[PDB]
Every structure is written in C-alpha cells, then in structure tokens.
mmCIF file with all atom_site columns, N, CA and C and ligand atoms in Angstrom:
data_model
loop_
_atom_site.group_PDB
_atom_site.id
_atom_site.type_symbol
_atom_site.label_atom_id
_atom_site.label_alt_id
_atom_site.label_comp_id
_atom_site.label_asym_id
_atom_site.label_entity_id
_atom_site.label_seq_id
_atom_site.pdbx_PDB_ins_code
_atom_site.Cartn_x
_atom_site.Cartn_y
_atom_site.Cartn_z
_atom_site.occupancy
_atom_site.B_iso_or_equiv
_atom_site.pdbx_formal_charge
_atom_site.auth_seq_id
_atom_site.auth_comp_id
_atom_site.auth_asym_id
_atom_site.auth_atom_id
_atom_site.pdbx_PDB_model_num
ATOM   1  N  N   . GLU A 1 1  ? -14.242 2.448  -4.047 1.00 29.02 ? 536  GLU A N   1
ATOM   2  C  CA  . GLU A 1 1  ? -13.135 1.496  -3.713 1.00 29.02 ? 536  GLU A CA  1
ATOM   3  C  C   . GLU A 1 1  ? -12.046 2.195  -2.929 1.00 29.02 ? 536  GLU A C   1
ATOM   4  N  N   . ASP A 1 2  ? -11.881 3.512  -3.108 1.00 27.82 ? 537  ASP A N   1
ATOM   5  C  CA  . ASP A 1 2  ? -11.033 4.324  -2.190 1.00 27.82 ? 537  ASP A CA  1
ATOM   6  C  C   . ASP A 1 2  ? -11.621 4.368  -0.762 1.00 27.82 ? 537  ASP A C   1
ATOM   7  N  N   . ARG A 1 3  ? -12.830 3.813  -0.587 1.00 22.17 ? 538  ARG A N   1
ATOM   8  C  CA  . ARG A 1 3  ? -13.386 3.537  0.723  1.00 22.17 ? 538  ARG A CA  1
ATOM   9  C  C   . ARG A 1 3  ? -12.964 2.165  1.234  1.00 22.17 ? 538  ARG A C   1
ATOM   10 N  N   . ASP A 1 4  ? -13.063 1.183  0.356  1.00 19.81 ? 539  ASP A N   1
ATOM   11 C  CA  . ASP A 1 4  ? -12.686 -0.195 0.624  1.00 19.81 ? 539  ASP A CA  1
ATOM   12 C  C   . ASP A 1 4  ? -11.173 -0.433 0.696  1.00 19.81 ? 539  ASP A C   1
ATOM   13 N  N   . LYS A 1 5  ? -10.425 0.305  -0.097 1.00 19.05 ? 540  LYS A N   1
ATOM   14 C  CA  . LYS A 1 5  ? -8.978  0.198  -0.130 1.00 19.05 ? 540  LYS A CA  1
ATOM   15 C  C   . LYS A 1 5  ? -8.413  1.610  -0.069 1.00 19.05 ? 540  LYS A C   1
ATOM   16 N  N   . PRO A 1 6  ? -8.465  2.233  1.126  1.00 20.15 ? 541  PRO A N   1
ATOM   17 C  CA  . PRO A 1 6  ? -8.142  3.643  1.289  1.00 20.15 ? 541  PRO A CA  1
ATOM   18 C  C   . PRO A 1 6  ? -6.669  3.997  1.308  1.00 20.15 ? 541  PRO A C   1
ATOM   19 N  N   . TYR A 1 7  ? -5.782  3.014  1.420  1.00 23.56 ? 542  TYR A N   1
ATOM   20 C  CA  . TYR A 1 7  ? -4.336  3.252  1.466  1.00 23.56 ? 542  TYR A CA  1
ATOM   21 C  C   . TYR A 1 7  ? -3.640  2.936  0.163  1.00 23.56 ? 542  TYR A C   1
ATOM   22 N  N   . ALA A 1 8  ? -2.598  3.673  -0.169 1.00 21.21 ? 543  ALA A N   1
ATOM   23 C  CA  . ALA A 1 8  ? -1.941  3.468  -1.450 1.00 21.21 ? 543  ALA A CA  1
ATOM   24 C  C   . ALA A 1 8  ? -0.451  3.764  -1.362 1.00 21.21 ? 543  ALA A C   1
ATOM   25 N  N   . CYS A 1 9  ? 0.322   2.978  -2.093 1.00 25.95 ? 544  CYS A N   1
ATOM   26 C  CA  . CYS A 1 9  ? 1.721   3.207  -2.239 1.00 25.95 ? 544  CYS A CA  1
ATOM   27 C  C   . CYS A 1 9  ? 1.897   4.484  -3.032 1.00 25.95 ? 544  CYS A C   1
ATOM   28 N  N   . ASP A 1 10 ? 2.747   5.353  -2.516 1.00 24.79 ? 545  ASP A N   1
ATOM   29 C  CA  . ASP A 1 10 ? 3.038   6.623  -3.187 1.00 24.79 ? 545  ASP A CA  1
ATOM   30 C  C   . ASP A 1 10 ? 3.848   6.520  -4.503 1.00 24.79 ? 545  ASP A C   1
ATOM   31 N  N   . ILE A 1 11 ? 4.536   5.401  -4.706 1.00 27.99 ? 546  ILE A N   1
ATOM   32 C  CA  . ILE A 1 11 ? 5.379   5.208  -5.891 1.00 27.99 ? 546  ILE A CA  1
ATOM   33 C  C   . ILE A 1 11 ? 4.548   4.561  -6.982 1.00 27.99 ? 546  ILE A C   1
ATOM   34 N  N   . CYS A 1 12 ? 3.896   3.442  -6.709 1.00 30.91 ? 547  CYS A N   1
ATOM   35 C  CA  . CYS A 1 12 ? 3.193   2.698  -7.763 1.00 30.91 ? 547  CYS A CA  1
ATOM   36 C  C   . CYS A 1 12 ? 1.669   2.777  -7.718 1.00 30.91 ? 547  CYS A C   1
ATOM   37 N  N   . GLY A 1 13 ? 1.102   3.401  -6.696 1.00 30.23 ? 548  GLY A N   1
ATOM   38 C  CA  . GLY A 1 13 ? -0.330  3.513  -6.562 1.00 30.23 ? 548  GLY A CA  1
ATOM   39 C  C   . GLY A 1 13 ? -1.091  2.277  -6.100 1.00 30.23 ? 548  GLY A C   1
ATOM   40 N  N   . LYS A 1 14 ? -0.405  1.164  -5.812 1.00 29.38 ? 549  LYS A N   1
ATOM   41 C  CA  . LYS A 1 14 ? -1.095  -0.042 -5.346 1.00 29.38 ? 549  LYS A CA  1
ATOM   42 C  C   . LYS A 1 14 ? -1.908  0.235  -4.104 1.00 29.38 ? 549  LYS A C   1
ATOM   43 N  N   . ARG A 1 15 ? -3.160  -0.203 -4.129 1.00 32.27 ? 550  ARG A N   1
ATOM   44 C  CA  . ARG A 1 15 ? -4.099  0.046  -3.046 1.00 32.27 ? 550  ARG A CA  1
ATOM   45 C  C   . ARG A 1 15 ? -4.228  -1.151 -2.123 1.00 32.27 ? 550  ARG A C   1
ATOM   46 N  N   . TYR A 1 16 ? -4.472  -0.811 -0.852 1.00 33.05 ? 551  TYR A N   1
ATOM   47 C  CA  . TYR A 1 16 ? -4.476  -1.739 0.262  1.00 33.05 ? 551  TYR A CA  1
ATOM   48 C  C   . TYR A 1 16 ? -5.673  -1.433 1.132  1.00 33.05 ? 551  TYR A C   1
ATOM   49 N  N   . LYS A 1 17 ? -6.326  -2.488 1.609  1.00 31.16 ? 552  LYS A N   1
ATOM   50 C  CA  . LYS A 1 17 ? -7.409  -2.315 2.567  1.00 31.16 ? 552  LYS A CA  1
ATOM   51 C  C   . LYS A 1 17 ? -6.924  -1.975 3.978  1.00 31.16 ? 552  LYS A C   1
ATOM   52 N  N   . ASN A 1 18 ? -5.742  -2.426 4.365  1.00 28.17 ? 553  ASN A N   1
ATOM   53 C  CA  . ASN A 1 18 ? -5.249  -2.321 5.749  1.00 28.17 ? 553  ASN A CA  1
ATOM   54 C  C   . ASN A 1 18 ? -3.833  -1.736 5.784  1.00 28.17 ? 553  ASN A C   1
ATOM   55 N  N   . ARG A 1 19 ? -3.492  -1.048 6.855  1.00 29.37 ? 554  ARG A N   1
ATOM   56 C  CA  . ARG A 1 19 ? -2.201  -0.467 6.959  1.00 29.37 ? 554  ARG A CA  1
ATOM   57 C  C   . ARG A 1 19 ? -1.060  -1.484 7.004  1.00 29.37 ? 554  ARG A C   1
ATOM   58 N  N   . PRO A 1 20 ? -1.233  -2.632 7.694  1.00 33.41 ? 555  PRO A N   1
ATOM   59 C  CA  . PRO A 1 20 ? -0.078  -3.562 7.736  1.00 33.41 ? 555  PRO A CA  1
ATOM   60 C  C   . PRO A 1 20 ? 0.323   -4.151 6.347  1.00 33.41 ? 555  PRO A C   1
ATOM   61 N  N   . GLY A 1 21 ? -0.659  -4.293 5.465  1.00 35.70 ? 556  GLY A N   1
ATOM   62 C  CA  . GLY A 1 21 ? -0.454  -4.707 4.050  1.00 35.70 ? 556  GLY A CA  1
ATOM   63 C  C   . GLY A 1 21 ? 0.403   -3.695 3.325  1.00 35.70 ? 556  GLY A C   1
ATOM   64 N  N   . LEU A 1 22 ? 0.026   -2.428 3.394  1.00 36.77 ? 557  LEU A N   1
ATOM   65 C  CA  . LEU A 1 22 ? 0.861   -1.381 2.804  1.00 36.77 ? 557  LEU A CA  1
ATOM   66 C  C   . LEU A 1 22 ? 2.229   -1.276 3.488  1.00 36.77 ? 557  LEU A C   1
ATOM   67 N  N   . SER A 1 23 ? 2.278   -1.430 4.815  1.00 35.09 ? 558  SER A N   1
ATOM   68 C  CA  . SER A 1 23 ? 3.523   -1.354 5.540  1.00 35.09 ? 558  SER A CA  1
ATOM   69 C  C   . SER A 1 23 ? 4.551   -2.320 4.919  1.00 35.09 ? 558  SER A C   1
ATOM   70 N  N   . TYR A 1 24 ? 4.117   -3.561 4.680  1.00 37.34 ? 559  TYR A N   1
ATOM   71 C  CA  . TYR A 1 24 ? 4.977   -4.611 4.135  1.00 37.34 ? 559  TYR A CA  1
ATOM   72 C  C   . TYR A 1 24 ? 5.441   -4.204 2.708  1.00 37.34 ? 559  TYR A C   1
ATOM   73 N  N   . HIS A 1 25 ? 4.513   -3.748 1.881  1.00 40.52 ? 560  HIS A N   1
ATOM   74 C  CA  . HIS A 1 25 ? 4.847   -3.306 0.499  1.00 40.52 ? 560  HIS A CA  1
ATOM   75 C  C   . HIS A 1 25 ? 5.843   -2.170 0.567  1.00 40.52 ? 560  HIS A C   1
ATOM   76 N  N   . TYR A 1 26 ? 5.574   -1.198 1.433  1.00 41.12 ? 561  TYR A N   1
ATOM   77 C  CA  . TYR A 1 26 ? 6.415   -0.019 1.560  1.00 41.12 ? 561  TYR A CA  1
ATOM   78 C  C   . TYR A 1 26 ? 7.822   -0.393 1.975  1.00 41.12 ? 561  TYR A C   1
ATOM   79 N  N   . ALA A 1 27 ? 7.949   -1.346 2.911  1.00 42.08 ? 562  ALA A N   1
ATOM   80 C  CA  . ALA A 1 27 ? 9.235   -1.792 3.440  1.00 42.08 ? 562  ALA A CA  1
ATOM   81 C  C   . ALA A 1 27 ? 10.131  -2.437 2.368  1.00 42.08 ? 562  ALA A C   1
ATOM   82 N  N   . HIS A 1 28 ? 9.531   -3.127 1.426  1.00 40.17 ? 563  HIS A N   1
ATOM   83 C  CA  . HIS A 1 28 ? 10.296  -4.021 0.569  1.00 40.17 ? 563  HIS A CA  1
ATOM   84 C  C   . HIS A 1 28 ? 10.198  -3.743 -0.939 1.00 40.17 ? 563  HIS A C   1
ATOM   85 N  N   . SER A 1 29 ? 9.328   -2.840 -1.378 1.00 44.24 ? 564  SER A N   1
ATOM   86 C  CA  . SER A 1 29 ? 9.148   -2.585 -2.816 1.00 44.24 ? 564  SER A CA  1
ATOM   87 C  C   . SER A 1 29 ? 9.966   -1.405 -3.328 1.00 44.24 ? 564  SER A C   1
ATOM   88 N  N   . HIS A 1 30 ? 10.306  -1.451 -4.605 1.00 46.20 ? 565  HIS A N   1
ATOM   89 C  CA  . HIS A 1 30 ? 10.922  -0.299 -5.283 1.00 46.20 ? 565  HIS A CA  1
ATOM   90 C  C   . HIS A 1 30 ? 12.318  0.029  -4.829 1.00 46.20 ? 565  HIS A C   1
ATOM   91 N  N   . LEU A 1 31 ? 13.028  -0.975 -4.320 1.00 46.19 ? 566  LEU A N   1
ATOM   92 C  CA  . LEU A 1 31 ? 14.383  -0.813 -3.803 1.00 46.19 ? 566  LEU A CA  1
ATOM   93 C  C   . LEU A 1 31 ? 15.464  -1.251 -4.831 1.00 46.19 ? 566  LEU A C   1
ATOM   94 N  N   . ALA A 1 32 ? 16.591  -0.567 -4.775 1.00 45.52 ? 567  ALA A N   1
ATOM   95 C  CA  . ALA A 1 32 ? 17.812  -0.877 -5.569 1.00 45.52 ? 567  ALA A CA  1
ATOM   96 C  C   . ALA A 1 32 ? 18.453  -2.241 -5.218 1.00 45.52 ? 567  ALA A C   1
HETATM 97 ZN ZN1 . ZN  B 2 .  ? 4.498   0.476  -4.610 1.00 46.84 ? 1330 ZN  B ZN1 1
#
C-alpha cells in the first residue's frame, strides 16, 4: 500500500495516492 499510497503527512501519517491530495492536507491541517 506504500506503493498505492506512497505519500504521507509528516505530522499525522495520513497516506495519499497523489501529490495534490497531500498538498491540500499539508496546506490546511494541524494549524493553530
Ligand atoms: Zn496530517
């Protein structure tokens, strides 16, 4: 599945199949 969903958020570990999916999570998650 690290083949199918090779990208991951460094804070929560959520896995993503595509970079734009992670990009959106990264932009808006885990903020004050
Ligand atoms: Zn995260």
